[PDB]
Each structure stands twice: as structure tokens, then as C-alpha cells.
Amino acid sequence: ETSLVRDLLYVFQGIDGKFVKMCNSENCYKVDGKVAVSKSLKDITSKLSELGWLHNKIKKYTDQRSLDRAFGLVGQSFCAALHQELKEYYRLLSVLHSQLQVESSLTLRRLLVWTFDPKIRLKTLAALVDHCQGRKGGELASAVHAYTKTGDPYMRSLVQHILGLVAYPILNFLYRWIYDGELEDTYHEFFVASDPVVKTDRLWHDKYSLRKSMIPSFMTMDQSRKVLLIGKSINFLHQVCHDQTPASKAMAVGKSAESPKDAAELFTDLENAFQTKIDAAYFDTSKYL
Amino acid sequence: LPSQETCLVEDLLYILIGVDGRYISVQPLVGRQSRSFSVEQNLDSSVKELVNRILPVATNYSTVTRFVEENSSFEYGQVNHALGAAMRTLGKEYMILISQLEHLQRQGLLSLQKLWFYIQPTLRTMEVLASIATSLNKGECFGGATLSLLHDRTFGYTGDSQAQELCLYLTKAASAPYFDILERWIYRGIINDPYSEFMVEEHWDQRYTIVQQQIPSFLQKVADK
Numbered sequence: 001e002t003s004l005v006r007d008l009l010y011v012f013q014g015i016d017g018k019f020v021k022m023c024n025s026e027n028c029y030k031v032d033g034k035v036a037v038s039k040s041l042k043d044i045t046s047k048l049s050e051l052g053w054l055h056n057k058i059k060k061y062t063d064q065r066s067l068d069r070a071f072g073l074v075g076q077s078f079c080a081a082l083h084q085e086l087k088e089y090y091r092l093l094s095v096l097h098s099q100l101q102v103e104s105s106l107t108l109r110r111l112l113v114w115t116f117d118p119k120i121r122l123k124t125l126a127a128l129v130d131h132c133q134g135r136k137g138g139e140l141a142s143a144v145h146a147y148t149k150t151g152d153p154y155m156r157s158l159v160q161h162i163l164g165l166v167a168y169p170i171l172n173f174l175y176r177w178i179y180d181g182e183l184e185d186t187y188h189e190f191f192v193a194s195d196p197v198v199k200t201d202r203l204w205h206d207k208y209s210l211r212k213s214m215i216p217s218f219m220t221m222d223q224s225r226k227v228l229l230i231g232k233s234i235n236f237l238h239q240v241c242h243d244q245t246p247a248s249k250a251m252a253v254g255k256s257a258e259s260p261k262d263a264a265e266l267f268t269d270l271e272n273a274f275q276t277k278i279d280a281a282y283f284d285t286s287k288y289l
Numbered sequence: 290l291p292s293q294e295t296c297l298v299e300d301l302l303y304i305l306i307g308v309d310g311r312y313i314s315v316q317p318l319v320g321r322q323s324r325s326f327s328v329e330q331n332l333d334s335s336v337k338e339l340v341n342r343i344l345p346v347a348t349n350y351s352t353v354t355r356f357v358e359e360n361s362s363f364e365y366g367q368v369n370h371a372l373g374a375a376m377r378t379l380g381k382e383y384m385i386l387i388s389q390l391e392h393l394q395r396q397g398l399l400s401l402q403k404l405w406f407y408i409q410p411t412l413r414t415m416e417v418l419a420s421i422a423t424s425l426n427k428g429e430c431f432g433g434a435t436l437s438l439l440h441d442r443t444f445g446y447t448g449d450s451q452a453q454e455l456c457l458y459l460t461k462a463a464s465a466p467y468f469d470i471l472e473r474w475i476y477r478g479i480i481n482d483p484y485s486e487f488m489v490e491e492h493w494d495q496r497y498t499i500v501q502q503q504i505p506s507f508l509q510k511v512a513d514k
Binding site (some may be wrong): 001018037038039040041042043044045046047048051095099102104105106107108110112113114115116117119122124127128145146147148149150151152153154155156157158159271272275 | 296298299300301302303304305306307308309310311312313314315329351357358359361362363364366367368369370371372373374375377378380381383384385386387388389390391392393394395396432433435462463466473476477479481483484501
């Protein structure tokens, strides 16, 4: 009884405890090698099978890539989330051992079910990881936005935490390029790759392509051409023998306000109000130019 | 022969948390609508009926939670996804009372009739989510017609408080997404169509068209307004 309770803690923390299960794939099945015991023990060994395997699949993805500086943008900001909900699995692992020792000790169907709330929590991270094998941004933003069009705000709140965090490098490309316009790309994490062509004098040539294969799904098509239009005009006022941010230093106050608003705000990515005050910057920077 | 009464109890409590037991084998099938659980032969005809009585309550919860906790997480992110995730939110605290019972099961203090009277308010709690779970997978309904069905379900239901309490709540927590994007549509006017969520869609004006298969749940005059 309690030795199988002690075995189920070690596969929750990882790979096999008392005996050897010899399977890393398709579920982590407990083999006891006993026939004279009841056959009802074996099916709870099969309940443990997909608890421990669905936990080690989250260790498998973030350790197989084995953190890489190349494509080190939005991909690992998705992993920094993936470690914080890895973290949430461990906090219910500690209440289960305080049940185990004395300070009651028998863990029965109460905790047998307590375990299925990690299960649906890990299935949420399992559906989140099966979409994306790669770590390149842009296509990650069409992934979690395809997971919020699904209803039922149980995991829809959880992927809303991810779309607020997947976008957080994406929209950090935006408002600085609206406000100062100092290019900071290394692997083109945004859909606007800034300066991939050699610098030439301006003949109204398009250096900032929008690249359909990496568009976020919260940014529609008329807004992707819009942020190109503000980003093309902000670079044309740098070489007008003026380093002045458009018409006031109030463009620099705006970035600070936005960064505190992001700090105060819980997890939500704004897209209906985000598109409104960039009109008030687009009409601002065009009349001053 | 007195040990077998506890030996089925510990087998039962692991069935209750939705996972496979020791000798109570679990049969999985596609479209299960409360999949069956195969109990072992035992030594006394009375004690099996008590675990045969608690088992549909373990059966009907563990199934109707299981697919709505996974199909919603696989699906879009419409009003049916905030609905199913709130069933998953209510499923978090159900596993808490089982584990506090197992703190009292470090030594035997309860029997099977003590198990069922404790889970008696919760078996009425799961079973009105069970009838939601059957219709939404047979129909595979769309988001305008999901809330229209889910409204009608909590409405011809009386007789118990805490079942009526939740089946209002999560449908109210599915209608409250709908009202907000309605209020984005009646004030600002920006519509967010992930895939679709409305009867009204863009495109001598031909700007808007209505479908009668994505209507809201209230009487048809307010959908026309």
C-alpha cells in the first residue's frame, strides 16, 4: 500500500522510483512483476502511467532544445512561461509528501483524484507543446491565438496568460520603433525585419517587408500595413537633419506610460485599445513630417 | 474477510480521482458517455453493492470531466472554451475534498456508507454538468448556438440549490464573454472574429448579414436590436 504511495512520488518528481518501468514513451507504465496481488492494483499503476509520462514530456521539450542563443527571442519567452507552470506542478507535489510522513499517511482515492487536476493542467501544457516544435517567433503568435478562439475559460485563461507573454516581445518591437526607431533585430523575431537590405538613398524603396509567414493572428492585415506606415515615416525623419522625436518629447513620455501600464496589468494583451492610440501617433508623426 | 472491505475501499478512492485502480479495471471507449468500470469478484454480496452504488458517481464525474477538460483545451477559444475551463475550475476543488478524506484514511475511520453521504451534495453537482457534456459532443455546436442551448438547460431546472447555483454560474460566465464583445460591437464597433462567434458578419448597402444558426439565447427581438 504505502510503498506504492512512496513510488508514486518519485515518478511525479521524475523517472522511476522503487522499481524500473523501462518506458519513456507513450506512457510510463509501472511493472511490479507480481501476479498473486490483486489485479486492481495494476490499473492504478496505469493511472500513474500517464501522470508521470505527461510530466516528463514537459521536461523533454525544454531540455532537448538545450537552450540556444540562435532564435533566442520569443521561443524562450514561451519557455519562461513553460518553467512557471512547470513550477505550479511542483507545489501540489509538496502537499502530497506532507500527507505521507507523520507530524493521514495513507493516500487513497482522495489524492487519487487530487492528481487529475495536475493531469488536466499538464494536458493544457501538452496541447500547448504539441503545436510548436520550433522556437521561432511569429508562428508562435498564430499558435496561442488559435488556442484562445476555443471557448471554455478553464484553459482559455491559461493560454491568455501565454498570448499576453508571447506578444510581449512582439509588441516590444513596436512602440519603441514608433517612438525612437533604433533597430534591434538579430534573427527577425518580428514580422518587420528591420534593415535586411544594404543602406541606400531613399527612392521610396521598401526596405521593411512584412513577411506573411510570421504574422501574429491578433494583428489583422490592415494593421500590419499600418505599423509599416508609421515605421517608414519615423525613419524618414531621422535623416531630415533632425533627431527630434515627433513634434514633442511627449512621444518619450508615452513609452514610459505604456511600460507602467504593462507592469500594472494582469496578463491580458490589448489589441482593440492598442490599435487606437497608434492612430494618435500615426496622425501625429505625419503632420509634423 | 474483514480486510477485503478496506481492500476495496483503497481500490475505490483511486477510481474516484479519475485514474485506474488496483483491481477495478477501467474500459475506455470513444464516445463513452460514462464508460464502464469492471469490479472484481468479492467475498460478500452486500459490500459489492455499496461500491456498486458509489461507482456511477465516480463514473459519471470522471468521464464528463475528462473530455470537456481535454476537447476544450484542444479547441478554439470561443464561449464553449471558457465554459469548459470553468468546469475544470470547479473540478479543482472536487479533488481537494477527496484528499482531506484521505488524511482521515491514514487509519480506517470511514466505511462505504460514510463515503456516499459525504459525496451526496457533490453527486448532484457533477450530474447536471453531465447532461451538458452529452449534447455538446453529439451536436458539436457553434458558439452562438452553444450559449443558446446552455441557457435553456439551467432554466427548466429546479429542485436543488447547488446544482442550479453552478449551472447558472458557468453559463453566466459564458454569457459574460458574449455581452462584452456585444458591448465592444455596440459602442466602439470593432468586432473580433477568431473563427466566428456571431450571427452578424461583415458582407445600396450589403454590409451586414444575419444567420439564424448563431443567434443568441434571448428572445429574437433583442438579437434584431
